[PDB]
Amino acid sequence: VRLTFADIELDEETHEVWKAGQPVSLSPTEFTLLRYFVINAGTVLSKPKILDHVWRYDFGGDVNVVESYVSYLRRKIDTGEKRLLHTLRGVGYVLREP
Amino acid sequence: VRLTFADIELDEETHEVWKAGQPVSLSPTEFTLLRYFVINAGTVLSKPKILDHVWRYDFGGDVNVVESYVSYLRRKIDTGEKRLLHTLRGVGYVLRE
Amino acid sequence: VRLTFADIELDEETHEVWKAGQPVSLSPTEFTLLRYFVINAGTVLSKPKILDHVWRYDFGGDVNVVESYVSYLRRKIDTGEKRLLHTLRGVGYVLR
Amino acid sequence: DSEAVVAVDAVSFTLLQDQLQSVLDTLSEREAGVVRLRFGLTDGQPRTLDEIGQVYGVTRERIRQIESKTMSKLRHPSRSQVLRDYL
């Protein structure tokens, strides 16, 4: 029932997340979307469905906040030299080893 | 769940492509071009319908963009001896060995 | 759904014609002419039928265009020993 | 009398004419005029792409695209079903 992606060992039950042996403290919003991405591993994630499931149905806010998240995740977990989350315009974001 | 045509493999679920040994990053437009081609492999496609589906219906720009994007593919897909995709004059395009 | 007459095998979806396993590439005009011939095997089609269907209605030119195209198709797929695309003078053409 | 007017298809024809008018008016004015002058409804001549281009100040390629778009939106289920019974 444990979640993993190569170099990131993700735990929901304990709610701790490990960047390859080192624990990382993350808030729910990102913890949820990170867990969401690993549940549908091997799949690009389009903003529409991101705001749909990972966020609320009634969200009337803007969309660049998705860029704001992927920015914080890049500077927080993806600080490693290799890239685990891949952007691609028009459609969205995938989780994958480089 | 997976689309196969000769030396062309597409897994739309992981949204990845495999060409006789190696994948290639593809912009949504050209990826949608290729996925529609392999979905209708062996069936000719005319520009009007190809724009209507692979582009948005609200499109009102020029038509040379389709030829330009087919060239964008050709510089990446048709490097082999066989013409994987053919350009049927006055009709449209098709993907067939 | 494959259009056939003895030797000639025309497929719409893949857009080429076979002579008992012999494909040949044809011009779009001639392709429509051959297709709308084959779907009317054994039936006479007159010149106004041909011009109104294969060409658009507003074709304001002279008729020998279809004459030249039937010549093309004859030298292309009739090139076998037997003659299939026969002509009825002053009436039209039939593939048979 | 083979050539005589059957007198019941004439009413069908005029009413189908009115219905075609209404369906064409459902579409945009530009596309409706393009189709009208392209199939010869206002007059007897269905003009050519060059003629509609010179009367509308538009390129023949854009005319082809506008015709294809018009035909696609004309294929729409209500128009198709409405016209289908008239046959």
XYZ file of C-alpha atoms in Angstrom:
378
model
C 0.000 0.000 0.000
C 3.112 2.171 0.078
C 3.652 4.679 -2.715
C 6.969 5.037 -4.516
C 8.509 6.655 -7.586
C 12.138 5.621 -8.069
C 13.890 8.116 -5.781
C 10.823 9.339 -3.826
C 9.202 7.048 -1.249
C 5.738 8.445 -0.503
C 3.746 7.361 2.559
C 0.122 8.337 3.112
C -0.626 6.396 6.303
C 2.346 7.907 8.146
C 1.961 11.039 5.947
C 5.750 11.316 5.611
C 7.541 11.615 2.271
C 11.196 10.712 1.608
C 13.386 12.267 -1.137
C 15.578 9.112 -1.433
C 16.277 8.585 2.311
C 15.811 12.198 3.531
C 12.368 13.130 5.013
C 10.618 16.245 3.557
C 7.875 18.319 5.297
C 5.059 19.186 2.815
C 1.591 20.802 3.264
C -1.589 18.854 2.225
C -2.446 20.712 -1.043
C 0.898 19.532 -2.546
C 0.954 16.237 -0.577
C -2.499 15.467 -2.082
C -1.537 16.340 -5.707
C 1.810 14.475 -5.328
C -0.155 11.416 -4.088
C -2.691 12.043 -6.908
C 0.099 11.964 -9.552
C 1.580 8.679 -8.193
C -1.912 7.024 -8.123
C -2.080 7.611 -11.904
C 1.634 7.094 -12.548
C 2.648 7.016 -16.187
C 0.125 9.671 -17.194
C 0.172 13.380 -17.980
C -2.067 15.491 -15.750
C -4.010 18.289 -17.430
C -4.851 21.443 -15.436
C -8.617 20.942 -16.127
C -8.683 17.588 -14.243
C -6.154 18.964 -11.726
C -8.554 21.713 -10.699
C -11.383 19.180 -10.980
C -10.155 16.475 -8.585
C -7.053 17.756 -6.778
C -8.902 21.031 -6.264
C -12.558 21.869 -5.784
C -15.454 21.732 -8.225
C -16.515 25.311 -7.428
C -13.078 26.891 -7.962
C -13.620 30.269 -9.600
C -9.991 31.346 -9.264
C -7.368 31.693 -11.957
C -5.204 28.989 -13.518
C -1.581 30.180 -13.185
C -1.722 28.963 -9.598
C -0.977 25.551 -11.140
C 2.308 27.013 -12.365
C 2.765 28.400 -8.833
C 2.484 24.909 -7.315
C 4.694 23.113 -9.825
C 7.217 25.874 -9.128
C 7.263 25.212 -5.379
C 7.456 21.452 -5.926
C 10.352 21.916 -8.362
C 12.270 24.055 -5.886
C 11.409 21.777 -2.947
C 11.556 18.116 -4.048
C 12.852 18.323 -7.629
C 15.957 20.165 -6.400
C 17.762 17.004 -7.477
C 19.784 17.291 -10.654
C 17.485 14.919 -12.543
C 13.877 15.845 -13.262
C 10.907 13.806 -12.027
C 8.023 16.124 -12.979
C 7.875 17.142 -16.636
C 6.026 20.162 -18.002
C 4.546 20.191 -21.495
C 2.495 23.150 -22.673
C -1.034 22.789 -24.018
C -1.772 19.640 -22.025
C -0.021 19.741 -18.650
C 2.354 17.795 -16.423
C 3.631 14.228 -16.112
C 5.657 12.364 -13.494
C 8.580 10.415 -14.924
C 12.292 9.778 -14.646
C 14.430 11.731 -17.152
C -5.219 1.440 -24.721
C -2.317 1.093 -27.166
C -2.006 1.953 -30.864
C 0.336 0.035 -33.175
C 1.321 0.554 -36.814
C 4.530 -1.037 -38.154
C 7.511 0.871 -36.703
C 5.103 3.229 -34.914
C 3.967 2.643 -31.320
C 1.725 5.055 -29.418
C 0.584 4.633 -25.828
C -1.854 7.496 -25.339
C -2.320 6.478 -21.701
C 1.291 7.261 -20.890
C 1.105 9.626 -23.889
C 4.410 8.346 -25.240
C 5.700 7.307 -28.656
C 8.197 4.639 -29.804
C 9.936 4.668 -33.209
C 11.918 1.583 -34.165
C 13.931 2.032 -30.959
C 13.635 5.589 -29.571
C 10.849 8.008 -28.430
C 10.648 11.728 -29.447
C 9.137 14.695 -27.588
C 6.047 15.868 -29.523
C 4.051 19.135 -29.125
C 0.310 18.536 -28.386
C -0.591 19.607 -31.970
C 1.721 17.097 -33.682
C 1.010 14.422 -31.058
C -2.714 14.816 -31.740
C -1.929 14.649 -35.469
C -0.130 11.334 -34.979
C -2.795 9.887 -32.677
C -5.557 10.717 -35.156
C -3.454 9.204 -37.945
C -2.938 5.919 -36.095
C -6.598 5.879 -35.037
C -7.574 6.233 -38.715
C -4.598 4.285 -40.093
C -5.505 2.908 -43.504
C -8.194 5.582 -43.962
C -7.527 8.767 -45.927
C -8.191 12.105 -44.231
C -9.072 15.400 -45.903
C -7.803 18.758 -44.561
C -11.281 20.150 -43.576
C -12.011 17.187 -41.223
C -8.383 17.048 -40.050
C -8.473 20.703 -38.992
C -11.938 20.293 -37.475
C -10.806 17.493 -35.167
C -7.093 17.901 -34.483
C -7.470 21.688 -34.201
C -10.278 23.537 -32.468
C -13.512 24.113 -34.373
C -13.162 27.860 -33.716
C -10.066 27.946 -35.943
C -10.055 30.594 -38.656
C -6.379 30.912 -39.512
C -4.493 29.876 -42.619
C -4.270 26.331 -43.983
C -0.516 26.119 -44.712
C -0.028 25.311 -41.017
C -1.105 21.725 -41.730
C 1.580 21.269 -44.384
C 4.115 22.904 -42.065
C 3.240 20.516 -39.226
C 3.323 17.524 -41.578
C 6.852 18.638 -42.451
C 7.534 18.906 -38.704
C 6.575 15.231 -38.517
C 8.476 14.250 -41.684
C 11.745 15.591 -40.302
C 11.173 13.100 -37.447
C 9.003 10.157 -38.613
C 9.680 9.500 -42.315
C 13.467 9.141 -41.992
C 13.094 5.500 -43.030
C 13.078 4.202 -46.581
C 9.313 3.625 -46.616
C 6.971 6.608 -46.871
C 5.040 6.021 -43.650
C 2.688 8.923 -44.413
C 1.512 9.910 -47.887
C 0.294 13.280 -49.150
C -2.542 12.512 -51.574
C -2.801 15.547 -53.846
C -6.141 17.333 -53.788
C -7.484 14.950 -51.119
C -5.440 15.109 -47.936
C -3.059 12.905 -45.959
C -2.926 9.283 -44.827
C -0.703 7.018 -42.711
C 0.000 3.671 -44.382
C 3.008 1.499 -45.171
C -17.536 -2.661 -49.067
C -14.744 -3.203 -51.601
C -15.674 -2.143 -55.128
C -14.910 -4.816 -57.698
C -15.319 -5.852 -61.296
C -13.423 -8.990 -62.321
C -9.915 -7.626 -62.848
C -10.277 -4.178 -61.277
C -10.322 -3.848 -57.478
C -11.034 -0.364 -56.101
C -11.000 0.429 -52.385
C -12.340 3.821 -51.317
C -10.856 3.969 -47.820
C -7.228 3.354 -48.828
C -7.536 5.140 -52.200
C -5.784 3.003 -54.811
C -6.752 0.471 -57.482
C -5.474 -3.059 -58.175
C -5.358 -5.161 -61.357
C -5.489 -8.631 -59.778
C -2.811 -7.516 -57.335
C -1.334 -4.660 -59.403
C -1.771 -1.210 -57.816
C -1.506 2.006 -59.778
C -1.691 5.638 -58.673
C -4.346 7.722 -60.495
C -5.211 11.470 -60.651
C -8.157 12.596 -58.414
C -10.438 13.421 -61.407
C -9.713 10.034 -63.009
C -10.123 8.370 -59.599
C -13.636 9.754 -59.141
C -14.388 8.818 -62.753
C -13.233 5.229 -62.187
C -15.081 4.938 -58.862
C -18.399 6.219 -60.208
C -17.903 3.978 -63.237
C -17.299 0.844 -61.167
C -20.326 1.449 -58.955
C -22.355 1.499 -62.216
C -20.979 -1.659 -63.833
C -22.940 -2.810 -66.868
C -24.948 0.424 -67.053
C -24.639 3.141 -69.686
C -23.731 6.564 -68.303
C -24.282 9.470 -70.656
C -22.031 12.504 -71.009
C -24.283 14.818 -68.923
C -24.324 12.188 -66.159
C -20.533 12.002 -66.250
C -19.971 15.753 -66.295
C -22.563 16.566 -63.632
C -21.326 13.946 -61.179
C -17.549 13.608 -61.597
C -17.065 17.254 -62.516
C -19.058 19.989 -60.856
C -22.182 21.332 -62.538
C -20.627 24.709 -63.390
C -18.167 23.092 -65.793
C -18.635 25.523 -68.674
C -16.018 24.019 -70.978
C -16.261 21.578 -73.848
C -16.864 17.879 -73.341
C -13.718 16.188 -74.782
C -12.221 16.419 -71.295
C -14.029 13.176 -70.405
C -12.862 11.745 -73.738
C -9.242 12.351 -72.739
C -9.820 10.906 -69.265
C -11.415 7.747 -70.661
C -8.356 7.492 -72.902
C -6.169 7.785 -69.786
C -8.099 5.065 -67.961
C -8.049 2.810 -71.028
C -4.295 3.085 -71.494
C -3.872 2.608 -67.726
C -6.137 -0.242 -66.552
C -7.595 -1.542 -69.846
C -3.984 -2.089 -71.016
C -4.652 -5.806 -70.585
C -5.553 -7.873 -73.620
C -9.321 -7.613 -73.093
C -11.229 -4.341 -73.449
C -13.506 -3.515 -70.505
C -14.311 0.218 -70.703
C -16.298 0.053 -73.925
C -17.896 3.063 -75.607
C -21.369 3.458 -77.119
C -21.112 6.162 -79.770
C -23.279 9.184 -79.077
C -24.414 7.691 -75.763
C -21.618 7.129 -73.267
C -19.286 4.597 -71.655
C -19.695 1.272 -69.823
C -17.169 -0.896 -67.999
C -18.001 -4.538 -68.722
C -49.844 11.670 -68.793
C -46.245 11.195 -67.671
C -45.342 14.871 -68.122
C -48.396 16.148 -66.224
C -47.913 17.829 -62.860
C -48.794 15.342 -60.123
C -50.165 18.315 -58.123
C -49.162 16.844 -54.759
C -45.376 16.997 -55.191
C -45.655 20.680 -56.160
C -46.923 21.541 -52.672
C -44.185 19.371 -51.179
C -41.619 21.216 -53.299
C -42.745 24.715 -52.321
C -42.936 23.825 -48.624
C -39.487 22.233 -48.774
C -38.329 25.464 -50.426
C -39.621 27.444 -47.445
C -38.000 24.995 -45.016
C -34.674 25.281 -46.851
C -34.973 29.063 -46.598
C -35.474 28.788 -42.834
C -32.597 26.327 -42.378
C -30.260 28.554 -44.394
C -31.296 31.536 -42.270
C -30.336 29.546 -39.160
C -26.710 29.791 -40.315
C -24.600 32.933 -40.554
C -25.376 35.362 -43.367
C -21.938 34.979 -44.973
C -22.089 31.177 -45.129
C -25.742 31.223 -46.208
C -24.947 33.540 -49.110
C -21.914 31.459 -50.057
C -24.028 28.296 -50.227
C -26.857 30.083 -52.057
C -24.602 31.420 -54.813
C -22.657 28.131 -54.802
C -25.702 25.933 -55.468
C -27.828 28.356 -57.497
C -30.862 29.102 -55.328
C -31.284 32.869 -55.690
C -30.632 32.485 -59.431
C -30.270 29.525 -61.761
C -26.463 29.483 -61.866
C -24.425 27.850 -59.110
C -21.379 30.079 -59.488
C -17.738 29.057 -59.168
C -15.263 29.724 -56.366
C -13.705 32.534 -58.405
C -17.094 34.227 -58.822
C -17.991 34.043 -55.142
C -14.472 35.297 -54.391
C -14.817 38.330 -56.633
C -18.263 39.125 -55.223
C -17.176 38.683 -51.581
C -13.630 40.103 -51.680
C -12.208 36.866 -50.283
C -9.669 34.286 -51.431
C -10.821 31.046 -53.039
C -9.025 28.984 -50.379
C -10.876 30.813 -47.606
C -14.031 30.145 -49.622
C -13.271 26.417 -49.624
C -12.707 26.482 -45.860
C -15.908 28.486 -45.278
C -17.850 26.007 -47.426
C -16.458 23.043 -45.483
C -17.242 24.723 -42.154
C -20.750 25.576 -43.366
C -21.331 21.988 -44.470
C -20.067 20.644 -41.139
C -22.412 22.847 -39.111
C -25.207 22.114 -41.601
C -24.751 18.371 -40.953
C -26.047 19.105 -37.461
C -28.636 16.613 -36.177
C -31.697 18.892 -36.117
C -31.152 20.200 -39.655
C -30.382 16.713 -40.956
C -33.461 15.187 -39.304
C -35.709 18.067 -40.397
C -34.652 17.752 -44.034
C -34.542 13.932 -44.003
C -38.319 13.473 -43.867
C -38.617 15.554 -47.063
C -37.615 12.617 -49.267
